[PDB]
């Protein structure tokens, strides 16, 4: 609801934090 | 057994047939005719060919072979040297 | 820190795709 | 109803989905689509495949980059015993904890998949060794593969010319290439192997520091320029060698001497270099053959023109084949394809029996999934070769400009050409098939005797006039002596081309009636495959049923019913139809090696002998014997050794089968229920208003002949991919 | 082209010969002498789909038409819906 | 003689084939026909593949390993009629299939409406143009290449 130019922001942001820490982990619990 | 220098003698038989014309008439490259820039139409698809120009030195520079190829091959390349040898030079008969 | 080189399969096999399946929906429109 | 796709126009405002697909498959068809000029086009393929070379180095870079920090090398260069090298680390969150089970392979830590490409024995086989000494690869190749793009642009920018007419010379180029390129491209290679590699092979290292200080000898290039060459080849290598570490090394580059070794098969150190040298005169002597302004040599017409060997007095012309191979660009990309196609197999059929690498066959896997990615392709070419030489005939070509002229007459006297082709096949058909059912009716029937089985005489024959010093046999003038060579002897054919029978790796395997069939069934392939490609080609122009089949020639797939009933009668759909037999030859052939090899390794050879002379058995032992390993690899009893492969192998059987739809479906049925199935949405709540931007349709009437195929193919080619590997890996053999 | 498939012949007479084909072909345009004197190959073709019902009947003695149009609307394929 | 081994006069591997394999044909100690008059493995089927003893004729016949016999036919040592003898035979028989193909065909295209006389058959097999084939001495080997089917008609 300030949508006035966005979405590009939420697709680096949100999707670099559903995947940055989301894949990494400090002591596996492996594949 | 092998005349190895039978044929390196032999191949610079022919490319001295290359020492040719850098010298004798006019410029380079029968001066770039057509190379860069692109002869129209005639570079077009084509030209030239001439079954008639296999002469000129057939007779003269067919000697070029026997040059290096004689006295400068199996007969110890230029023994008549000396011309500044001290930062070294020699040069010395491996033969 | 210990044992952590896992980002070049989502950024590629996952997120790079996001970009283009989004982005390249430029074929539809832009 | 808007406007989009930025090159075509009919495609651009087509309201359906065709809009999309047909966009992503007209891209590369420059010659004639909106945006084009003979000036545009040429350059629009030029800075295209400068976009090439470019993608080949981002490939190679990473090939040398999943290797240098893991993926054994300061291992496998300690001694390369047939236990599981490495490509790269497999990493998928779907993996079970049997991440621990093989899949995870010995030396390295996390799971991996090992080099079945050769790279691993040529990054090594030209020296390139130490794991502190090694980590270059991308670093260069890539500080290269970017330049590959720079011209792309630089030569795309008008100003500093992208060159237009200059694209139809020849003479100048190819008077340049087969000297400048190849010749010095050799040479310079001859350079490298020799200063930096041969030393790295038999002898010792080369240190990143010195390059002057290192001298293959004590007293330099010595004579050499002194025409005296010979005394390279004396005590060059040895045999009590220990490959890579001198000691019985000796140091005199070049030879033809010594030969095979239980410690490495592979062409000798030197020879791949006097050769690389040796040929590098001929091309350099060859380069410098045509004009390029100065005023010597040749015009590429005037030695066609009225050249002609059996022409002269046989009323059969030769007019400007130049301004039609030159004004064609398809003739071009199809004499290009083939040569490559013929030599892609000459590469890959010589790459065995003569592999030039430190440990390869005596590897026997990488050796068998590398003859074929060079048999697939190669076959895969040939077709495309034959397929851009039936486009020349339609888009380009020019009956009034080629006539009485020997490219015509080829058209004109064509009905014969396919017939005396088809007569080969039908003969090569039932006659192979008599011999193979008969051979299979007789077994089963209890009589292994009665079996029809011709020795491959003219085969083994070629070889008892070589080195196949198999169990004696004279031959009138030869005997095994009296006359031997006389003119030849202790020079040339020394220990080499003297592998003989060598049950292990003799080069030539000892051929019998099992081979007098496959060898006539690879022959029934490229013949049938080509009656269709020769035909496909020999009238993309038209014929009786469709006389005026043109202005578009190639892919017009389909025509109305009536006349006789007319169908896959575009030169594409014969190409389309061709690719099945290029996928059936390039199967019988590859199929053949392996069964042979397999058997000729960790076991017998009698096996292929009395059990390839028939057909059932080709299915039973091979096909049915030798899958074993893989399939009980998902096993009700946990994931064992291989699992990628067998899942691939059933991914193999699906992608295949699911071709068929596309192939027995034909747009009509599909479109129509989509007519009913697009009465849904429109008539159903919580999914109304909701507009498509592309109108739901069923695939084009050419498109699906493709997609079933480009589907038929992967399945098929992804099945053997997984098959052979999944069985040449335990083996046994 | 945009619909360009040649059914032409030489008689272009249309009695017990050919009529079939959704809208596309409002001919009978007598060229000053061709026997039953009605001629050519089409009228305004920017209307209908891509049949070869076009020949199937009454000669084209050469080819006969089919799909070749490429540039292809929607009203030109039943399905723009 | 050539690549495989020698004929029947000796061929060890071949011998073993004769014996095990067939004779296990045996394999049925009895299986009742002590006197009985049907079940004929017993008599021939063996003996017809079998009394084919250390004789089969004698044929030469090369026999490789496993001793299944291979066919050279290069016209030498013994083996000539494993292709030519039954080769010219294939030629002669065919060609007198199609010599008459080009005959109960070139005899029709004439008279009055001749437009499918061929779905029925005028003289069955041709039984008129029949022997034209054995009644080929020379024949097409001249008259094909000179006249009739003459380059004209080419
Ligand atoms: C569609 C397929 C394609 C693919 C994916 C491959 C893949 C492969 N091929 Mg291959 N090949 C193909 C088509 C393909 N090929 C075709 C069509 C042919 C026939 C022409 C071949 C003939 C072929 C041969 C003979 C071999 C391979 C080999 C290989 C393997 C080696 C890796 C490699 O290629 O690095 C490629 C490396 C480069 C591109 C860089 C090297 C190029 C050098 C020569 C450039 C020299 C330029 C130099 C700078 C100029 C010097 C001038 C100055 C310094 C004086 C790899 C598996 C090799 C193998 O067997 O592995 C075991 C080898 O045997 N291929
Ligand atoms: C080395 C290459 C060579 C070159 C330089 C060209 C160049 C060209 N070809 Mg061509 N071709 C070649 C080899 C080559 N070809 C071979 C070997 C074959 C068959 C053996 C063909 C069969 C072929 C056909 C049928 C046609 C061309 C056409 C063309 C022209 C347009 C290109 C195009 O349509 O692609 C655009 C394609 C795409 C953008 C991608 C769609 C391709 C699909 C089928 C994917 C293929 C399978 C794929 C690898 C599987 C999916 C991957 C999977 C792992 C998911 C262009 C002049 C066209 C033409 O202009 O002729 C009139 C067309 O008719 N070619
Ligand atoms: C295994 C398969 C099957 C068979 C038997 C054939 C056979 C043939 N294909 Mg073919 N084909 C196939 C699958 C098959 N195809 C598939 C899947 C495709 C791709 C979808 C193609 C695509 C293709 C193309 C493009 C062409 C062929 C051609 C041919 C013919 C080539 C000449 C030849 O090889 O010898 C002759 C035939 C054989 C050896 C097969 C046996 C035929 C005889 C022996 C029948 C047996 C008689 C029997 C006792 C009587 C039973 C009948 C009844 C009375 C009970 C041949 C008839 C070409 C052609 O037309 O050549 C002129 C060429 O056009 N094929
Ligand atoms: C192995 C086969 C292949 C597949 C997958 C299909 C699938 C289908 N065919 Mg079919 N068909 C085939 C070969 C195939 N066919 C062949 C060879 C022929 C003739 C020779 C036909 C003749 C035919 C006819 C006449 C009809 C069909 C119909 C159908 C549809 C039936 C409804 C259905 O259950 O689909 C959905 C289910 C599947 C396709 C199977 C599951 C697929 C798995 C692998 C799941 C993958 C999904 C997952 C999200 C993947 C995404 C991952 C990402 C990496 C992409 C279905 C799409 C009919 C139809 O349209 O009715 C609805 C119609 O009756 N077919
Ligand atoms: C119910 C069936 C099913 C189906 C539909 C298939 C289908 C297929 N299998 Mg398959 N398979 C099956 C069950 C099935 N399999 C089972 C139960 C097993 C045992 C686990 C296998 C083991 C298997 C293996 C090991 C292979 C396949 C391959 C294939 C593919 C061959 C592709 C082709 O077009 O022909 C190509 C077929 C041939 C060229 C001939 C194979 C048939 C053999 C018996 C004869 C050899 C040809 C002969 C010697 C030369 C011609 C003689 C002639 C000139 C007279 C095909 C997709 C192969 C593949 O990857 O395809 C490339 C691979 O070889 N299968
Ligand atoms: C009387 C017979 C006749 C003759 C003289 C020929 C002759 C020829 N045919 Mg042919 N053909 C025939 C009948 C005949 N055919 C029939 C009935 C068919 C089935 C449609 C074909 C299908 C065929 C094909 C696909 C091809 C040929 C080709 C050829 C040529 C190559 C020969 C070859 O290798 O094929 C061997 C012959 C056959 C496969 C034909 C089988 C039919 C024979 C057995 C007919 C037997 C007589 C028959 C019963 C007539 C009744 C007798 C009557 C007097 C009462 C050659 C000119 C090839 C060509 O064009 O290259 C020049 C091409 O490959 N033929
Ligand atoms: C095109 C090439 C080639 C290929 C087929 C691959 C393939 C792969 N690389 Mg890789 N890589 C390459 C060149 C290549 N690489 C180069 C030149 C570098 C040095 C910059 C790397 C540095 C690299 C790292 C650090 C990693 C991979 C990883 C991987 C794997 C996961 C995909 C990924 O995220 O890559 C990432 C790729 C890059 C960072 C390189 C970007 C360079 C551009 C120019 C290439 C884009 C080309 C594209 C096809 C268009 C996959 C097997 C990942 C892995 O180990 O998982 C198993 C790991 O993340 N690569
Ligand atoms: C294209 C053909 C091919 C050829 C050249 C042969 C040739 C032969 N077959 Mg044969 N066969 C074939 C295909 C062929 N077959 C096929 C496809 C089948 C399966 C239907 C068979 C099933 C078969 C059987 C069951 C038998 C033969 C037998 C024979 C031999 C007997 C001929 C004879 O009695 O001459 C005598 C007269 C003259 C020479 C005149 C002969 C060597 C017979 C045999 O004795 O085994 C070798 C045996 O009856 N064949
Ligand atoms: C298939 C073959 C054909 C081809 C490609 C060749 C090729 C070759 N022959 Mg050759 N040759 C052939 C038929 C062929 N021959 C025949 C039919 C005869 C019988 C007279 C010979 C008798 C012959 C002799 C005596 C020699 C060659 C030699 C050679 C090599 C000459 C290069 C050289 O060392 O000087 C070259 C590889 C020479 C060689 O280098 O072999 C040791 C020489 O020894 N050939
Ligand atoms: C199923 C089927 C259809 C229907 C069309 C369908 C089913 C299209 C369905 C789309 C699928 C689900 C897309 C999945 C493909 C993915 C791999 C994505 C493709 C990405 C590309 C850009 C490469 C036809 O139109 C047709 C036409 C002519 C002959 C045979 C057939 C036929 O068999
Ligand atoms: S009937 Fe067919 S002119 Fe005759 S072929 Fe042309 S439309 Fe009428
Ligand atoms: S042939 Fe074409 S123009 Fe004629 S009716 Fe059919 S679609 Fe219309």
Domain B1-95: CATH class, spelled out: mainly alpha
Distance CA D464, CA D582 (A): 33
Largest CA distance in chain C: 46
Return the best residue to mutate from D430, D438, D443, D616 for the ligand 8 pocket (most ligand atoms within 8 A of CB).
D438
Tell me the technique behind this structure: X-ray
Structure tokens at D287: 């380069």
Give the orientation angle of helix D138-145 with respect to helix D147-154, to 10 degrees: 0
Give the domain extent around D107: 1-733
Angle at D194 between CA D190 and CA D195, to 5 degrees: 120
Question: E2 preceded by cis ω (within 30°)?
Answer: yes
In three-state secondary structure terms, A29 is coil
Contact D173, D290 (CB under 8 A): no
Task: Give the structural domain span for F11.
Answer: 1-154
On chain A, the residues whose CB falls within 8 A of the CB of C3 are: 26-28
User: E24, E27, E22, E21: which is closest to E9 by C-alpha?
Assistant: E27
Distance, in Å, from the CA atom of D523 to the CA atom of D413, rounded to the nearest integer, reads 25
Q: Tokens in use for D212?
A: 């002057």
Q: Which residues does a gap of C–N over 2.5 Å follow in chain E?
A: none
Nearest atom of ligand 1 to the alpha carbon of D344 = 19
D283 and D276 Cβ atoms separated by less than 8 Å: no
Q: Which residue has the tokens 């892609």?
A: D344
Classified as helix, coil or strand, B43 is: helix
* CB pairs < 8 Å spanning C and D: 12
CB contact under 8 A, D455 and F65: no
d(Cα D331, Cα D321) in Å, to the nearest integer? 10
D729 neighbors D629 (Cβ within 8 angstroms): yes
For residue D466, report the distance from its CA to the centre of ligand 9, in Å.
10
Angle between helix D51-63 and helix D138-145 axes, rounded to 10 deg: 170
Among candidate residues E10, E29, E7, the one with its CA nearest the CA of residue E20: E7
Give D465 to chain F, closest Cα distance, Å.
14
Distance CA D134, CA D343 (A): 33
Beta-bridged to residue E63, according to DSSP, are E61
DSSP string, D472-494: ----TTTTTSSSS-SS-SSSSSS
Q: Is D710 left (phi over 0), alpha (psi -120 to 50) or beta?
A: left
Q: Which class is domain A2-24?
A: mainly alpha
- Contact D384/D337 with Cβ under 8 angstroms? yes
Report which bound ligand comes closest to the CA of D149: 7
Ligand 9 lined by D485 (C-beta under 6 Å): yes
E2/E73 Cα distance (integer angstroms):
10
Nearest Cα residue in chain D from C6:
D91
- How far apart are the CA of D28 and the centre of ligand 2, in A? 8
Residue E51 sits at the chain D interface (C-beta within 8 Å): yes
Ramachandran assignment for D99, one of left (phi > 0), alpha (psi -120 to 50 degrees), beta (any other): alpha
Domains contained in chain F, number = 1
Q: F68 to chain D: which residues are within 8 Å by CB?
A: 448-449, 451, 453, 610, 613
- Between CA E63 and CA D48 the distance in angstroms is 38
Residue D307 labeled ligand binder: no
Domain at F127, CATH number: 1.10.8.110
Closest CA to F3 of F80, F74, F87: F74
d(CA E78, CA D695): 11
**Domain of E34, in residue numbers:** 1-81
Q: Which of D524, D573, D579, D515 is nearest to D379 (CA)?
A: D579
Task: Say if CB F59 and CB F81 are below 8 A apart.
Answer: no
DSSP chain F: --SS---SSS-HHHHHHHHTTGGGS---S--S-SS-SS--STTTTSHHHHS--S-S--------SS----B--SSSSS--TTTSHHHHHHHHHTTTTTTTTTTTTTT-S-SS--SSTTTS-SSGGGTTSGGGGTT-SSTHHHHTTSSSS-GGG-
> CB under 8 Å to D169, separation ≥6 — which residues?
B38, B43
Rounded Cα–Cα distance for residues D394 and D330 (Å): 10
Mutate to test the pocket of ligand 2, among D330, D331, D388, D583 (most ligand atoms within 8 A of CB): D388
DSSP D247-270: SS-------S-S---SS--SS-TT
Listed by number, the residues of chain D in 34-93 with a beta carbon closer than 8 Å to a beta carbon of chain A are 91-93
Beta bridge partners of D405: D317
D639 is known to lie in a ligand binding site = no
Tell me, in Å, the resolution of the deposited structure. Answer: 3.5
Q: Is F56 exposed, middle or buried (0-12, 13-18, 19+ CB in 10 A)?
A: middle
Of the bound ligands, which one is closest to the alpha carbon of residue D659? 4
For residue D49, which phi and psi values (nearest 5 degrees)? -80, 30
Contact E64 D560 (CB under 8 A): yes
Q: Which chains touch F (3 or more CB pairs under 8 A)?
A: D
Tokens of D263: 């410690």
Q: Is D572 annotated as a binding residue?
A: no
φ/ψ of D405, rounded to 5, equals: -95, 135
> Contact at 8 Å (CB) between F50 and F22?
yes
Four-residue CA torsion sign, E32, E33, E36, E38: negative
R_g of chain D computed on alpha carbons: 30
Residue of F27, F44, F46, F68 to mutate, testing the D interface (most D Cβ within 10 Å of its Cβ): F68
Phi-psi sector, D207: left (phi>0), alpha (psi -120 to 50), beta: left
Q: Which of F17, F66, F71 sits opposite D454 (nearest CB)?
A: F71
Q: How many Å apart are CA E37 and CA E59, to the nearest integer?
A: 15
Helix (H) or strand (E) holding D724: helix D712-725
Taking the centre of ligand 3 as the mean of its atom positions, its distance from the CA of residue D613, in whole angstroms, is 21
Q: How many beta-carbon contacts under 8 Å exist across B and D?
A: 65
Between CA D44 and CA D30 the distance in angstroms is 7
Helices (H) and strands (E) in chain A, counts: 0, 0
Which residues, other chains included, contact D692 with Cβ-Cβ below 8 Å and sequence gap of 6+?
none
Query: What's the number of domains chain D is made of?
Result: 1
Q: What subunits touch chain E, counting only 3 or more CB pairs under 8 A?
A: D
Rounded distance between C-alpha atoms, residue D32 and residue D554, angstroms: 13
What b/e sequence results for D279-303 when a residue is b if at least 16 CB atoms lie within 10 Å of its CB, and e otherwise? bbeebbeebbbbbbbeeeeebbbbe
C4 at interface of D, judged by CB pairs closer than 8 A = no
Most informative mutation of D488, D491, D493, D497 for ligand 9 (most atoms within 8 A of CB):
D488
Q: How far apart are CA D401 and CA D411, in angstroms?
A: 14
Q: How far apart are CA D30 and CA D258, in angstroms?
A: 55
CA distance D580 to chain E (A): 26
Contact C15 A15 (CB under 8 A): yes
Question: Which of F63, F72, F71 has the alpha carbon at shortest distance from F10?
Answer: F63
Question: How many domains, in total, are found in chain E?
Answer: 1
CA D65–ligand 7 middle distance (angstroms): 9
- Do the beta carbons of residue E71 and residue D9 sit within 8 Å? yes
């Amino acid at each position: 609801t300030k949508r006035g130019l966005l979405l590009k922001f939420l697709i680096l942001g949100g999707g670099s934090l559903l995947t940055y820490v989301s894949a990494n982990a400090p002591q596996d619990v492996l594949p | 057994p092998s005349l190895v220098i039978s044929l390196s003698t032999g191949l610079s038989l022919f490319l001295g047939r290359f020492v040719f014309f850098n010298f004798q008439r006019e410029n380079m490259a029968k001066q770039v005719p057509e190379q860069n820039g692109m002869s129209h139409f005639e570079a077009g698809d084509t030209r030239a060919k001439e079954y008639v120009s296999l002469l000129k030195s057939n007779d003269p520079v067919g000697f070029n072979i026997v040059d290096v190829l004689a006295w400068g091959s199996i007969g110890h390349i230029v023994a008549y040297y000396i011309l500044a040898t001290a930062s070294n030079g020699y040069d010395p008969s491996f033969f | 820190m210990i044992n952590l080189p896992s980002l070049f399969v989502p950024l590629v096999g996952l997120l790079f795709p996001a970009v283009a399946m989004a982005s390249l929906f430029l074929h539809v429109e832009k | 109803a808007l406007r989009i796709p930025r090159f075509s126009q009919g495609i651009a405002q087509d309201p359906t989905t065709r809009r999309i697909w047909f966009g992503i498959a007209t891209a590369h068809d420059f010659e004639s689509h909106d945006d084009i000029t003979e000036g545009r086009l040429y350059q629009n393929i030029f800075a295209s495949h400068f976009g090439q070379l470019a993608i080949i180095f981002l490939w190679t870079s990473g090939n040398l980059f999943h290797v240098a920090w893991q993926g054994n090398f300061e291992a496998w260069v300690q001694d390369p015993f047939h236990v599981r090298p490495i490509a790269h680390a497999i990493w998928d969150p779907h993996f079970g904890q049997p991440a621990v089970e093989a899949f995870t392979r010995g030396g390295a830590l996390g799971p991996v998949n090992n080099a079945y490409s050769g790279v691993y024995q040529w990054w090594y086989t030209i020296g390139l060794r130490t794991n502190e000494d090694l980590y270059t690869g991308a670093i260069f190749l890539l500080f290269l593969s970017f330049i590959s793009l720079l011209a792309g642009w630089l030569h795309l920018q008008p100003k500093w010319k992208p060159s237009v007419s200059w694209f139809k010379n020849a003479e100048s180029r190819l008077n340049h290439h087969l000297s400048g390129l190849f010749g010095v491209s050799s040479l310079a290679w001859a350079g490298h192997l020799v200063h930096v590699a041969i030393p790295g092979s038999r002898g010792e290292y080369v240190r990143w520091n010195n390059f002057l200080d290192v001298l293959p000898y004590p007293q330099g290039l010595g004579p050499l320029l002194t025409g005296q060459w010979n005394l390279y080849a004396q005590n060059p290598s040895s045999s009590n060698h220990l490959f890579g570490t001198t000691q019985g090394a000796g140091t005199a580059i070049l030879t033809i001497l010594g030969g095979f070794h239980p410690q490495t098969q592979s062409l000798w150190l030197t020879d791949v270099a006097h050769h690389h040298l040796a040929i590098a005169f001929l091309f350099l002597i060859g380069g410098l053959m045509y004009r390029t302004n100065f005023g010597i040599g040749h015009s590429i017409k005037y030695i066609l023109e009225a050249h002609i060997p059996p022409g002269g007095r046989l009323g059969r012309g030769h007019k400007g084949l130049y301004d039609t191979i030159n004004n064609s660009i398809h003739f071009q990309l199809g004499l290009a394809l083939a040569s490559l196609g013929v030599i892609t197999s000459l590469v890959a059929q010589h790459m065995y029996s003569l592999p030039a690498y430190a440990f390869i066959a005596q590897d026997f896997t990488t050796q068998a999934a590398l003859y074929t990615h060079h048999q697939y392709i190669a076959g895969f070419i040939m077709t495309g070769a034959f397929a851009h030489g039936p486009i020349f005939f339609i888009r380009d070509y020019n009956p009034e400009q080629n006539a009485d002229n020997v490219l015509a007459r080829m058209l004109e006297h064509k009905e014969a050409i396919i017939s005396h082709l088809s007569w080969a096949s039908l003969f090569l058909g039932f006659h192979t098939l008599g011999l193979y059912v008969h051979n299979d009716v007789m077994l089963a029937f209890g009589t292994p005797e009665k079996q029809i089985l011709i020795e491959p005489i003219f085969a083994q024959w070629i070889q008892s006039a070589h080195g196949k010093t198999t169990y004696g046999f004279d031959i009138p003038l030869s005997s095994t002596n009296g006359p031997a060579l006389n003119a030849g002897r202790n020079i040339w054919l020394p220990g080499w081309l003297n592998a003989i029978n060598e049950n292990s790796n003799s080069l030539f395997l000892t051929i019998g009636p099992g081979d007098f069939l496959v060898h006539h069934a690879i022959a029934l392939g490229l013949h049938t495959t080509t009656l269709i490609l020769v035909k496909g080609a020999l009238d993309a122009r038209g014929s009786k049923l469709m006389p005026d089949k043109k202005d578009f020639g190639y892919s017009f797939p389909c025509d109305g019913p009536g006349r006789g009933g007319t169908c896959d009668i575009s030169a594409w759909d014969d190409f389309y139809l061709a690719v099945f037999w290029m996928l059936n030859t390039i199967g019988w052939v590859t199929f053949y090696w392996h069964w042979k090899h397999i058997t000729l390794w960790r076991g017998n050879v009698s096996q292929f002998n009395e059990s390839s002379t028939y057909l059932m058995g080709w299915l039973r032992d091979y096909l049915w014997l030798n899958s074993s390993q893989l399939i009980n690899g998902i096993t009700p009893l946990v994931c064992n050794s291989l699992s990628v492969w067998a899942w691939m192998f059933l991914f193999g059987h699906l992608v295949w089968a699911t071709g068929f739809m596309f192939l027995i479906s034909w747009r009509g049925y599909w479109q129509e229920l989509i007519e009913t199935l697009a009465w849904a949405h429109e008539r159903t709540p919580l999914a109304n208003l909701i507009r498509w931007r592309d109108k739901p349709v069923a695939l084009s009437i050419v498109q699906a002949r493709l997609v079933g195929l480009v589907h038929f193919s992967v399945g098929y080619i992804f099945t053997y991919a997984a098959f052979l590997i999944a069985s040449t890996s335990g083996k046994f053999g | 082209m945009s619909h360009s498939v040649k059914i032409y012949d030489t008689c272009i007479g249309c009695t017990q010969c050919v009529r079939a084909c959704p809208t596309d072909v409002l001919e009978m345009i007598p060229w000053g002498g061709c026997k039953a004197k009605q001629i050519a190959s089409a009228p305004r073709t920017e209307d209908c789909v891509g049949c070869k019902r076009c020949e199937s009947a009454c000669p084209t003695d050469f080819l006969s038409v089919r799909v070749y149009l490429w540039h292809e609307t929607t009203r030109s394929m039943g399905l723009a819906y | 003689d050539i690549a495989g081994l020698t004929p029947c006069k000796e061929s060890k591997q071949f011998a073993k084939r004769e014996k095990q394999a067939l004779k296990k044909l045996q394999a049925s100690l009895k299986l009742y026909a002590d006197d009985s008059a049907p079940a004929l493995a017993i008599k021939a089927t063996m003996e017809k593949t079998k009394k084919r003893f250390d004789n089969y004729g004698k044929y030469g016949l090369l026999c490789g390993s496993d001793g299944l016999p291979h066919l050279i036919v290069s016209g030498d040592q013994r083996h000539w009629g494993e292709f030519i003898t039954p080769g010219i035979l294939f030629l002669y028989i065919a060609g007198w299939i199609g010599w008459v193909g080009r005959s109960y065909l070139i005899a029709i295209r004439d008279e009055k409406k001749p437009t499918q006389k061929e779905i029925i058959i005028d003289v069955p097999l041709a039984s008129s143009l029949l022997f034209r084939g054995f009644s080929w001495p020379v024949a097409a080997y001249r008259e094909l290449l000179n006249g009739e089917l003459v380059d004209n008609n080419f």
